[PDB]
Amino acid sequence: VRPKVLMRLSKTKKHVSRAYGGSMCAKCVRDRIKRAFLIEEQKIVVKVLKAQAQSQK
């Protein structure tokens, strides 16, 4: 509906019950999640490998 109508509408009509509800598609959320997680794990792994390299040297 035309944007200035949204003003009238109830919250539920304007969004959806999810993280990034009504701003982003479901597909690209669940990728974000697992990207964010799989990225963070590799940072932790690299941090561990760095710490092992410090202990070695």
Backbone Cα Rg of the chain: 21
Residue 14 CA: distances (Å) to CA of 9, 21, 44, 56: 7, 9, 39, 57
* Total count of residues recorded for the chain: 57
Q: Which is nearer to RNA, 4 or 11 (CB)?
A: 4
5 binds RNA (CB under 7 A): yes
35 binds RNA (CB under 7 A): yes
Residues of this chain that bind Mg ion (CB under 5 A): 12, 16
Residues of this chain that bind RNA (CB under 7 A): 2, 4-5, 7-8, 32, 35-36, 38-43, 46, 54, 57
